[PDB]
């Protein structure tokens, strides 16, 4: 029955209108400065970068989405085999459903069978830490796919509007997560799920030892929309309230700025509405180490292996065109390339006390 | 005949297009910062707060609207009994009509019969203070409903365009109000009626002893539109002039800032176009002690008791979602939560000498 | 034939779409701060003010438009008799046509027959000063209507696009104007004609003794558009060029700021797209001494005396509404009332070095 | 092969929708301040200016476009003979095609036969410098048309999306350019091609001795769009990627500021979406020495000699109208005339560290 949410989630995400619904990444307020003399040739552009103890071919990852039933595993299988082929890391979807039901397990393990070398990232929700999950459940999530890291997701907005949601985010959870991390052999990433990570939340997680963040800002998949749709579907009164919250959250671009600023040494995934290699380039230039994507990977995967391969080919070409046209021979140069910040993003940073001088120095 | 006006007011506000007509709250310029780790659980959120010497369940009030005839009293009955059920304060409409006609009295008194515990707020207009009302009339308004406070409304814009209107706001009235307040056993609130309270107005009222304010800013019920409609209806020439004034006034959000800034210890109702618990959260976060609402309460009340009950359930849920998602365990924490101010509201504050640093400290 | 262009000007201005065509006054960036406690009564509001040596009932004037043929004089007759009834000053149209043709004279003189007490303002164009006009022609313009002042118009944008235009604006014209002003027994006002007065132009005129200005900024009657239509009509190639210039000039609001700032002691008419008594209030609050209007007066005058009477009644009502609602018992108080400046006007002032503190003090 | 590309470029530029496609010059953020007293007469305005060792009649040039086949030469012939008649300089299109194929030569030489006195500017692409071209090729391009200068184009964005493009911009190319310039008897201009010159690029070029720049900013011909169209036509996958890059580049107005700022003594052509004499005047007032145009000259030339004569007549009239209306007797006075800069261009300059005070002094 958690298993039908799982398919309903994928079905609404894949086929309903929830991508950027009434929301914004603020990435239109970021401009990469064009260099008419790049100083490089396209063919010498190098996109390799570090992902924990592995090297990856591109600074992009697929973030966690699904798992829990065999048709969901077939999607994970297509994503994982193509991610392997391209040398990109892949997070799986929440593994709760496979801690609760042994028959859900293969729909996650298939990822590692088909992708033996790339970084694979486990996944469990914060609310499960408040309800009993502890070290052993983390280790089971991890071994089930021989993960190189585990992502713990924050989705309080989703849970608030979810018909059968669990909006429990007591501080005790962080004490538990900090303890669990002492004992785990792989790092923890804390990621949002469409509503973004602010500086208050990043400093707080940081105070409990978390150094790896995934912004998942607003502007991309709108989980408040997804749950609004599930509410409409059951005639649940919450739907009209969800609609008032459609634009709730920290935009992706602002979240990247807030996390890089407030935790200058964090390992940062910039995600939530990254739809092109140009978006990916902007995310990294603003301050992320890697760009994350979920929804468009799902939509291509459902179309098939070849559609997904073409999708990555296009993302990668678009990333390298942005590096070419900013004179960035490598990911490190991209992180330092010249930008312009305009509009609401600029007003957001100013109000929030993001001194642009210190900002430029910190993103580099 | 003032009784026909009372009827025509309700009918135009309920059924014509005057909610936010050519006007704006500026609340879209206020963003509540999302906290992906709230640090609390939904179920522990506490919405109680003080309203003078009483405790109320939710920091929201229904502000004054109607009374004067038995159908108007049936509306007041429904609002009051639901307000009583939910532990929320209720203002009644202008009681002038019941000072002038004894047969109008029961349409107000019904409120206290059906709501014996909640704060009830009496109502008289400023222009009646310059025309002979004094202490006794205030006391009669109060005792008629065993009121816990009396609201004196400012409606000069309305009066100017009213067919019918009395635009008399001589300073003598304030002298009289200050004198009356010496003798009254309950507090006075001064409220606008759709065009908002500016800093010069709030400082002037304060200089005469007024400490309780209700912004009633523009962007909600447009009273200049309502009178425009009454002018059209009678082929009165003033209609075309009212139309040029549709966007006149201080936007709610700016008014909240101006009042809180210029009278930092004021008790503040933030109202005028509050249409969701999210709007209510923003109002409180910006500087108000409570959020006030009138028009959407009227619309639900007209549909009936159950519709009105559902409306409050939804407002309260939305308020709590916004507290949850900012990590606000209680009203006091919401007042201090992180915000961003952008766009025209930012420009309005800057031009008016609202130093944002000092604003932050003052709102807390 | 000059007589024909005068006919054609009125016809295009009255009947074609040239009011505010692709242009803006920037008055939407000026907000008058609402005072919910005005401290006054509508009936005590005083709108009297000084116009040179006379008193006028309202701080509004009708600016120069027409004259030159008998049907044009019938329009001047109607405007003048209504202006007399209301105690408002009236400028006449360029009197060149009546210096050149004695039969054109009565169409100006009728103004003074019918309006024996109000200020009447004569009119000649700056280009004529470089083409032979001097003292005697000014004195002839003045005595023809026993004028209390003479306006000299600037219209270089119009003359550039006019099929038979004279774009001659040699500095010698100012030397001549300065000399003439020594000898004249009435004051000179220099007025633009839909393209506005900048600070450089105001300071230059001031250096030659000019102390009285009429901004005639962009956003109201678009004279470039008028000449563009005349060019289309004659298949003149210039029409396409005029179209690129439709939005050329200083917006009225900016021009009022520029002139009041750069010449703090000037006598200032704020005009160019004043369409309501609210616009008129904003213009005075921004820095003008009086609001000027031309096109809407022509349109009403063409419809008849009673239409024109109704029009002034509405402007006056709207002006007094705005004074009531800002707590302005008189014109002097309106000049000092609180405002907000936002948007492009704000950015215009900042780029042009208009320090807002010193601005606030100067407008007063 | 390349001859076919040359024909398809002209056809797509002339007849498809690529002029300003999803892009912007930012010239709408530049306002020339109107001067109601210009202090000059239209007939005394002088538009002459220097272009290296020649005098040209108007501060406008036609920038390089075509050549390579006899129908392309017939367009070159028409533009050249009209340019000659008007005293305006003309660049030819890339001469690569005529270095590779001797039959393409006459389509360039024709320009000098028909325009013996005006400056003619040769053209080669920067990629060819890394691919074997050097002094001799430059000298051939120059003698082929007895050029007064040679433009070297930057088009890395075009090359990236061009189906058969060569994105090779190694620093060695600049080393070679600098060496060539020692030996050449005419100056070098470095020009972009629709995507604009940033300060980092201008400083880098300057460091290798280049002092002559042509902004060719985004907002006019969109070469990324043109190549997108060629990719669509060939079902080449890159088209979808080009589409994501449609708004890539430095807007013309921003590029003019960046170059004039970071290289104050540069000789500077402002181009990329100059469509009227008004645009031309803005470009010069902002900091360019001359305004450049390509696409609208092509579309006129294709209609014929008389159409192109009419086009120039219009551009020059518009330019002079803008001088007239700013009080600019000559090109030098235009470069110093008062402007306002607003909106995104203002935010762009602030973010990029362009101090407006120092900007003003340098643009003069
Ligand atoms: C269908 C599907 C389902 C999930 C997701 C999304 C998608 C589309 N996402 C959130 C996802 O990883 C990502 O953070 C957000 O979707 C923002 O990225 P995009 O805008 O989708 O690129 C998500 N995140 C998570 O941490 N655990 C989960 O199980 C899921 N589930
Ligand atoms: C039908 C009706 C009639 C009244 C009002 C409202 C409406 C809708 N309001 C104004 C109300 O108290 C509130 O200040 C404004 O309407 C702004 O709130 P809303 O935007 O309507 O939530 C009101 N104000 C008051 O002080 N005395 C009054 O009698 C009236 N009457
Ligand atoms: C039909 C007509 C004819 C003229 C004008 C206007 C109109 C509408 N105006 C310009 C006028 O006085 C005013 O400066 C502008 O029209 C801007 O004000 P409005 O936007 O029209 O209110 C004008 N100005 C002036 O100095 N002498 C002239 O003779 C003319 N004639
Ligand atoms: C048909 C065509 C062909 C060419 C171009 C343009 C056009 C439209 N342009 C670029 C051009 O010179 C100019 O920099 C840009 O087109 C921007 O100016 P416009 O917006 O077209 O005025 C160009 N530039 C150049 O240096 N060498 C050339 O071969 C070409 N070819
Ligand atoms: C976007 C995201 C985190 C989806 C998981 O939602 P959920 O609450 O259904 O996950 P779980 O299965 O962990 O409860
Ligand atoms: C919004 C508002 C204050 C309505 C009451 O106006 P009114 O002038 O009809 O009230 P009263 O009956 O007190 O004159
Ligand atoms: C708007 C305005 C000033 C019109 C008079 O133009 P004009 O050039 O025809 O006047 P004159 O008859 O004085 O040339
Ligand atoms: C806009 C511009 C510079 C066009 C020349 O393009 P190209 O790559 O076809 O030129 P070349 O013939 O020099 O390769
Ligand atoms: Mg969950
Ligand atoms: Mg009243
Ligand atoms: Mg004239
Ligand atoms: Mg090339």
Contact B341, B30 (CB under 8 A): yes
Partner-chain contact C196 D325, CB within 8 Å: no
Q: How far is D201 from chain C (nearest CA, A)?
A: 28
Please report, in range form, the residues annotated as the binding site of B for substrate.
Answer: 5-6, 94-96, 158
Partner-chain contact C170 D325, CB within 8 Å: no
For the record, the structure tokens of B51 come out as: 């309203």
Using CB atoms within 10 Å of the CB of residue A183, give its burial: 0 to 12 exposed, 13 to 18 middle, 19+ buried: exposed
Contact A148, A53 (CB under 8 A): yes
Residue D247 phi, psi (nearest 5): -110, 20
Query: Could you give the CA distance from residue D81 to residue D118 in angstroms, rounded to a whole number?
Result: 10
Q: Which ranges of A61-212 does DSSP label H, i.e. alpha helix? A: 70-86, 96-100, 106-114, 126-130, 135-143, 156-161, 172-183, 199-207
Query: Could you give the CA distance from residue B320 to residue A167 in angstroms, rounded to a whole number?
Result: 12
Query: Could you give the CA distance from residue C265 to residue C364 in angstroms, rounded to a whole number?
Result: 11
Residues in chain C: 364
Let me know the angle formed at the C-alpha of D339 by D333 and D343, rounded to the nearest 5 degrees.
155
Please report, in range form, the residues annotated as the binding site of C for FMN.
Answer: 63-66, 94, 123, 191, 216, 221, 273-275, 294-295
Q: Is B63 in the pocket of ligand 6 (CB under 6 A)?
A: no
Query: Could you give the CA distance from residue C251 to residue C228 in angstroms, rounded to a whole number?
Result: 20
Sign of CA dihedral A129, A131, A134, A136: negative
Query: Could you give the CA distance from residue D188 to residue B297 in angstroms, rounded to a whole number?
Result: 74
In terms of phi and psi (left: phi > 0; alpha: psi -120 to 50; beta: otherwise), the region of A284 is alpha
Contact D272, D196 (CB under 8 A): yes
Query: Could you give the CA distance from residue C83 to residue B347 in angstroms, rounded to a whole number?
Result: 40
Protein residue with its CA nearest to atom 25 in ligand 2: B64
> Comparing C-alpha atoms, which of B226, B244, B225 is closest to residue C277?
B244
Quote the DSSP letter at residue B103: G
Grouping H, G, I as helix, E, B as strand and the rest as coil, residue C293 is strand
Contact D14, D294 (CB under 8 A): no
Q: Is B193 in the pocket of ligand 6 (CB under 6 A)?
A: yes
- Which atom of ligand 1 has the smallest separation from the CA of A295? 21
Query: Could you give the CA distance from residue B5 to residue B94 in angstroms, rounded to a whole number?
Result: 12
Residues of chain D found within 8 Å of residue C347, distances taken between Cβ atoms = 340, 342-343, 346
- Those residues with Cβ within 8 angstroms of residue D8's Cβ, 6 or more apart along the chain or in another chain: D230
What are chain A's domains? 1-364 (3.20.20.70)
Query: Could you give the CA distance from residue D17 to residue D301 in angstroms, rounded to a whole number?
Result: 18
Which pairs count as long-range contacts for D300-305, CB under 8 Å and 24+ apart, including other chains? D301/D75, D301/D78, D301/D79, D301/D82, D302/D14, D302/D75, D304/D78, D305/D78, D305/D81, D305/D82
Residues in contact with ligand 7 by the CB-under-6-Å rule are: C 2, 5, 94, 96-97, 125, 153, 155, 158, 193, 223
Query: Could you give the CA distance from residue D115 to residue D336 in angstroms, rounded to a whole number?
Result: 32
Ligand closest to Cα of C99 equals: 7
Q: Is A97 in the pocket of ligand 1 (CB under 6 A)?
A: no
In terms of phi and psi (left: phi > 0; alpha: psi -120 to 50; beta: otherwise), the region of D210 is beta
Resolution (A): 2.3
> Comparing C-alpha atoms, which of A263, A240, D83, D76 is closest to residue B313?
A240
For the record, the structure tokens of C164 come out as: 């038979």
- Strand partners for D189: D151
Q: From the CB of residue A198, how many other CB atoms can be counted at a distance below 10 Å?
A: 28
Give one DSSP letter per residue of C231-289, joined into a string: HHHTT-THHHHHHHTTT-S-BHHHHHHHHHHHSTT-EEEE-SS--SHHHHHHHHHHT-S
Partner-chain contact A250 B356, CB within 8 Å: no
Q: Which experimental method was this entry solved with?
A: X-ray
Q: How far is CA A101 from the centre of its chain?
A: 26
Contact A336, A51 (CB under 8 A): no
For the record, the structure tokens of A188 come out as: 């923890």
Contact D183, D212 (CB under 8 A): no
Cis peptide leading into residue C236 (ω within 30°): no
Closest CB to C196: pick one of D34, D278, D327. D34
Query: Could you give the CA distance from residue D10 to residue D14 in angstroms, rounded to a whole number?
Result: 6
Partner-chain contact C317 B344, CB within 8 Å: no
> Comparing C-alpha atoms, which of D332, D349, D324 is closest to residue D288?
D332
Task: Work out whether strand B339-341 and strand C54-56 pair parallel, antiparallel, or are unpaired.
Answer: unpaired
Grouping H, G, I as helix, E, B as strand and the rest as coil, residue B120 is strand
Residues in chain D: 364
Contact B269, B249 (CB under 8 A): no
Q: Is B276 in the pocket of ligand 6 (CB under 6 A)?
A: no
Contact C31, C342 (CB under 8 A): yes
Residues in chain A: 364
Chain D touching partners, 3 or more CB pairs below 8 A: A, C
Q: Which ranges of chain B does DSSP label H, i.e. alpha helix? A: 2-15, 70-86, 96-100, 106-114, 126-130, 135-143, 156-161, 172-183, 199-207, 223-233, 238-244, 252-262, 277-286, 295-303, 305-324, 331-336, 343-351, 356-363
Query: Could you give the CA distance from residue C269 to residue C286 in angstroms, rounded to a whole number?
Result: 11
- Those residues with Cβ within 8 angstroms of residue C81's Cβ, 6 or more apart along the chain or in another chain: C114, C115, C305
Discontinuities in chain A with C to N beyond 2.5 Å fall right after none
Name the CA dihedral angle for C36, C37, C39, C42, rounded to a multiple of 10 degrees.
40
b/e D161-179 (16+ beta carbons within 10 angstroms → b): bbeebbbbbbeebbebbee
Quote the DSSP letter at residue D248: -
End-to-end CA distance of chain C: 47
Partner-chain contact D277 C171, CB within 8 Å: no
Query: Could you give the CA distance from residue C291 to residue C283 in angstroms, rounded to a whole number?
Result: 6
Residues of chain A found within 8 Å of residue D196, distances taken between Cβ atoms = 34, 36
Interface of B with A in 261-320 (CB under 8 A): 276-278, 310, 313-314, 317-318
Query: Could you give the CA distance from residue A13 to residue A128 in angstroms, rounded to a whole number?
Result: 23
């Amino acid at each position: 029955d958690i298993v039908n949410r799982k398919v309903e989630h994928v079905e609404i995400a894949a086929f309903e209108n929830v991508d950027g619904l009434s929301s914004s990444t603020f990435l239109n307020d970021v401009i990469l400065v064009h260099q008419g003399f790049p100083g490089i040739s396209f063919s010498e552009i190098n996109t390799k970068t570090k992902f924990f103890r592995k090297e990856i071919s591109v600074p992009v990852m697929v973030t966690g989405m699904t798992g829990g039933r065999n048709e969901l595993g077939r999607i994970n299988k297509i994503i994982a085999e193509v991610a392997e082929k391209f040398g990109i890391p892949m997070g799986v979807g929440s593994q709760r459903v496979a801690i609760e039901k042994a028959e859900a397990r293969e729909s996650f393990a298939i990822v590692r069978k088909v992708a033996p070398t790339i970084p694979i990232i486990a996944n469990l929700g914060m609310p499960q830490l408040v309800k009993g999950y502890g070290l052993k459940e983390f280790q089971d999530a991890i071994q089930m796919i021989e993960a190189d890291a585990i992502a713990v997701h924050l989705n309080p907005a989703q849970e608030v509007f979810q018909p059968e949601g669990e909006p429990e985010y007591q501080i005790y959870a962080l004490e538990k997560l900090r303890d669990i991390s002492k004992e785990l052999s792989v790092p923890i990433i804390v990621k949002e799920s469409g509503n973004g990570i602010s500086m208050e939340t990043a400093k707080l997680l940081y105070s409990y030892g978390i150094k790896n963040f995934d912004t998942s800002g607003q502007g991309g998949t709108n989980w408040i929309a997804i749950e609004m749709i599930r509410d409409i579907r059951r005639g649940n009164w919450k739907a009209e309230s969800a609609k008032n919250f459609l634009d709730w959250g920290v935009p992706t671009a602002a979240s990247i700025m807030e996390v890089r600023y407030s935790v200058p040494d964090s390992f940062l995934v910039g995600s939530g509405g990254i739809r092109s290699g140009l978006d990916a380039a902007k995310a990294i230039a603003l301050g992320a180490d890697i760009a994350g994507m979920a929804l468009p990977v799902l939509k291509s995967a459902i179309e098939g292996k070849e559609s997904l391969e073409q999708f990555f080919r296009k993302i990668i070409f678009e990333l390298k065109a942005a590096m070419m046209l900013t004179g960035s021979k490598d990911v490190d140069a991209l992180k330092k390339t010249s930008i312009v910040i305009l509009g609401k993003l600029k007003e957001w940073a100013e109000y929030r006390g993001i001194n642009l001088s210190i900002y430029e120095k910190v993103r580099k």
